[model samples]
Target: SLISKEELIKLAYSIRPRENEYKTILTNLDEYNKLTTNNNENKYLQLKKLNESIDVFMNKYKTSSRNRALSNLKKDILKEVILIKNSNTSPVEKNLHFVWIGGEVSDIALEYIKQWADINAEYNIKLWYDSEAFLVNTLKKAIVESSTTEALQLLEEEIQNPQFDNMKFYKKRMEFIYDRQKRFINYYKSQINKVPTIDDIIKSHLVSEYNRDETVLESYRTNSLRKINSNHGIDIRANSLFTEQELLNIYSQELLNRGNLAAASDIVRLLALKNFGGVYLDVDMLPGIHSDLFKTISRPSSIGLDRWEMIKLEAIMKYKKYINNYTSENFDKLDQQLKDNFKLIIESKSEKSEIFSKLENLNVSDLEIKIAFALGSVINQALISKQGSYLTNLVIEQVKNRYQFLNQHLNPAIESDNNFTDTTKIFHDSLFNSATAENSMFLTKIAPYLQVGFMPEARSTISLSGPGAYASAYYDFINLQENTIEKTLKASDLIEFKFPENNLSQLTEQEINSLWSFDQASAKYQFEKYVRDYT
Candidate 1:
């Protein structure tokens, strides 16, 4: 196919007029139009020269008032050249294919889809929208497999074995672990013969009370190792010094001795980072690639900003009390109200929304809140780090001391609160009261690090450990560097590495259409509001 002479004329007409530059561009456009239409001989070569001349004009006026018009003109010329090249290129093979995932496609994603169509046409690739068509290839692979009775037997065994069933296995492992841990606690208490009674705690004025088992902890350690190996394609050695099992056992033993599984788990997170410095991204996160983030780590540590604080102590007490001692008559109404409140919180558009105001009025604090620097942990998100840094080492030391105190003094005085008493009533009155007080301080006591900052991902879900712990650490880091001419952490330095934007706001409609071979009017209009919001 030949270049469309009429289309070129239209493009030339659409370009806005500019002072002296417009007169020259218009004059050339008219002459070029006339020559192309009236003289067909060597017309392709003549058009090629005209295209080069326009490029020269663009380069010259690229910074002037006529820049937009020049860019538009050049873009039109470039498309024509691309069309001509596509026709002249060698025939494409019809083999490569792509499968796009399903969803309501975003305008940005739609633009990319249209580009795939161009790639298909230009390079002999095939693109299919139907998922069923893509599945046909799976059948092709299956058809080549050999029939093996042994393999079939293995599959049957897997289905019948409860150990291989994920949910059942997980529950079974946890129960067994809990049982082992409880037995360990009882054994330790008998060895010391000093289990503390409620009266002892009340009278001795030992004014502190706090917060899983060990074999199960080891199981978790092994499981995490295997999971990372299989998922990340790494070969961590069983006997390695920094193996998860070793790190887990270090704290799991202390926890098992005291019957404090929750505290043990928290210690493991800190210990793992101390020895092996990897980011502890939660399952809910969508990770981005930015190696430059590593450059910001001035002294082998990096963390995100504080997003918010933990729930107030009174609120925790009230919530526990309500859960333990609510009337059946009001349960449904309260439950529905709680759900409605949660919905409002989730749907809230900003910090000052009606939902937040309502929550504050309820004495539940803001739906999202901040932990102050003085009282609690200062790190949030635990997003980035250099392996085994000074920051992790300090936390390890602090928790180790607390772990020692609980093991050496506390557990021996506390009886195994097994089914030996009114389990619900006793735990709610004595254990929950103490546990909540201890839990408030949970991971907040890590020795503050100098580089801790608020999580860039600011949200309530991450308020506690995310913002509270991390922000406190950042504040400490600031204090540590005060009045010193040291090259300490800078939030600006961490943010210098720009992340890639893959949204509608990043591209103009005209640019999207030209680049991706799509009509953009609908796409642009459909996403206009979102573009504004996100940008």
Candidate 2:
């Protein structure tokens, strides 16, 4: 695809913009030698003199009409490499981050996780192959086999046998090696497969490609090896430091010791340490300090809480970036426009695609789209959890009052012939409606719990049962909760189901209980009517 070496060199030359090259060159000369050459003064001097020549040439070409280009091509290459190195390292100082919070925001995490696994596994494998093809590809066939449904199924079948199942993880690793082998065979056939008879094999010609020799092949091997190692941390090119059993023992020991710690802890630790909110551990080696508390009135006093401080916590456990990004500030400006009357700044940008074209044509901007996305996502999450039963009347009101350009309202119009609606229609009406509704019930229900010392997620405490708690303590607590549910079921003031538009206030407990009574009534109907047949 790339035509010439000149074109490639031009691409390399564009790394650093044409802002005073002297400073970039001078500062980076030492680093260039450090990266490419030996750690000595002689190499440094050579690099310095080479850079000086470059400066002189640039100045000459600038001052005089005739461009005097010096052909110190190798030195030029080195300069570009250094430019790349600097560019690569610049984002590293504060680039990494993590978070630590624990609360179950119920939604399907499986789909998100599977999506990540597919993208991440393929990406990591490709990156590994790029750097250390032989090491990764050594077991590539086994990996492919493991990846395939049928092959993995066979592997699982083998795993199910009691003898093989005893050494499950170890057997899995071995199966993976075999899987990689199968994958390699598949890849080899995919790339080129000229299945020749024995007679034809003897006369099979080796096709010759243009301008490539052993040196080029070796270069490819070396570059690929380096890339694979750096990207994937594959130890293919390195000596085998330990046997599979040795690694297995170490892994088993770790699991035995720390298996009870939740996976969320790893993500939380990373967040606390890397974010500005962290206590920046290594310097402070404590484990339990909360650094990045948000939406709270005051910070906790912890002079003696060295046991609580931690640096490099973990990544987000449950906060899906796609979901968070939907709500976060980027182009979504409806909140700003509606909330503060700020004219949308997103429309000033030029369009890139048909979606952008539509936005422009329809007088929609990034801000508006973003606002719509956020409102839509929040409402979607709520509706998913509520599952059509919560916001029927509220949704209808929103459609009529909030949104415009209504041709004929979808299904549940303010004036409708039939009231019966399916689940699909409920979602359709909810999404199309402009006036977004919140679960005033959930908002109000948590208030009494707040009084009982349940902190917001940010300040929530984690602890096992305390003091004189016995085995039945958990069951006792469950019974207590059941009793509370009975008491609150039909109290009309427990939560406000629907309210006037002007009153954005949260509902009281009696209103919430009144709505929850409907839920209880439905549950009772299902149990009382259906159970008699089964019984």
Candidate 3:
């Protein structure tokens, strides 16, 4: 991202104001989900009520707080997940966790962790290292104990296809060439052979197909898990709630389901917070303020809306009429009209000034479509939580389930279809029902605006266990209006983070070493301390 400390601080401040509308939408959604049923009439009326409440309150006019007797009515939106029950009463413990996995601790990254440890000297600090050994064992365990599953069954079928050997084709994507490659294809092919030893087949399948070197890569696989099992590197093992076997089972599902070992950190961060019960900081982050500020946080869990990249829109679309009014009767006619009008604005060959006026003047399904330079997209880069916090439990479990939902549902033929096509119904439906699906849809919607247009890995990463998925889980609790959890914490003003050395994975050792011109140990600590004490 190459974002500076000062830039992040400024970005954080910009995120504070829009949070009310954020909470406002979640609150209204809580109420709507309470009354909404499969009934179209009921849903329509409820949505109308939801839309009006959001607008009136969102624009600084207000109402809808009569009895407050709907305390027990708050339930999560999705019923698919088996929730880990946490009453949300426990206060966060004074344990700090930093996750630096899969590679060497760069000078700057190490410096940050050391500074964090010193800054919060009273807290227990744990560093989580990548466990290749754990990954190998988990894969073995999954193979041994796994019930015949559909994902694997499908993977097996897909492996035999002529075009299945992707590693040989895409040599540039080296990250996936090892872990993600389907070496099992050869195992399936060898079943008819005379000298097909099962041991050789299994061993061959373990190593990468593209660059098959057992000495360098195969030996490295078991070392990481060994280190962690032995409780090396200020191990998370000491603070962990579950046994290694229990975690092995849990992690096996994640690795097998996602088919990528690197993606384990998302699950690891949540697991660490749930067990150890405190703050989980990304390795690159430092406290924007004095370390004392972290101690005073008393919520069950906290999350914030961080501003996304400033998007420049040629034209942003919105409906010009009421969604509730256009039902099964007139919906066919009016829906076409709405898109026709929007298409005219979007296809403005004449003047952007006219298009700008048209976009600025008319609003959503009921007018009042305000524009921010860019809006705050809710996400969790750092999670501060109590052990088994309600929000944390909901989010982690949602992420777990959403993986399969996305895994099965993401476009199978996306070689042609990558970005989102405009949908009139979604633009209208998202007025209140903007949680999991809506936020997720926007990823495809706004991806073209990014430097890269709709990289499925980024989409898959976020949807499976990243920010979009977290935000959905966040909204589910709030939409259901779960108690014990407060409204979204506006931590943007309080917490500023940086990931300046993100290139540690991409850059060469000499190039990386050249960047650390200052002393590695005290540089970050002294800088943060000076910022707090002097600035």
What TM-score, over all chains together, does every model reach?
0.26, 0.16, 0.40
Clashes (N, CA, C under 3 Å) per candidate = 34, 51, 2
| 385 Cα displacement, candidate 1 (Å) | 1.8
Worst 10 residues of 2 by lDDT: 364-373
State each model's CA lDDT, in order. Answer: 0.31, 0.25, 0.39
- Model 3 off-target regions past 4 Å? 1-91, 103-108, 130-180, 184-213, 218-262, 289-375, 407-457, 481-535
In the range 442-531, model 1's lDDT, one tens digit per residue, is 322221110011111112212222343343343323222111111223554223111222101112222223232213343334223322
Predict model 1's lDDT versus the native.
0.31
How does candidate 3 fare on TM-score?
0.40
Any runs in candidate 1 off by more than 4 Å, and if so which? 1-181, 184-229, 233-250, 253-265, 288-381, 404-409, 415-476, 481-535
Query: What's the CA error at residue 473 for candidate 1, in Å?
Result: 4.2
lDDT of 3 by residue, 454-511 (tens): 1222334555566655555554443433221113424342121112121111121222
* Best first by TM-score, ranked: 3, 1, 2
Global local distance difference test of model 2 = 0.25
User: What shift in Å separates residue 159 of candidate 1 from its native position after superposition?
Assistant: 39
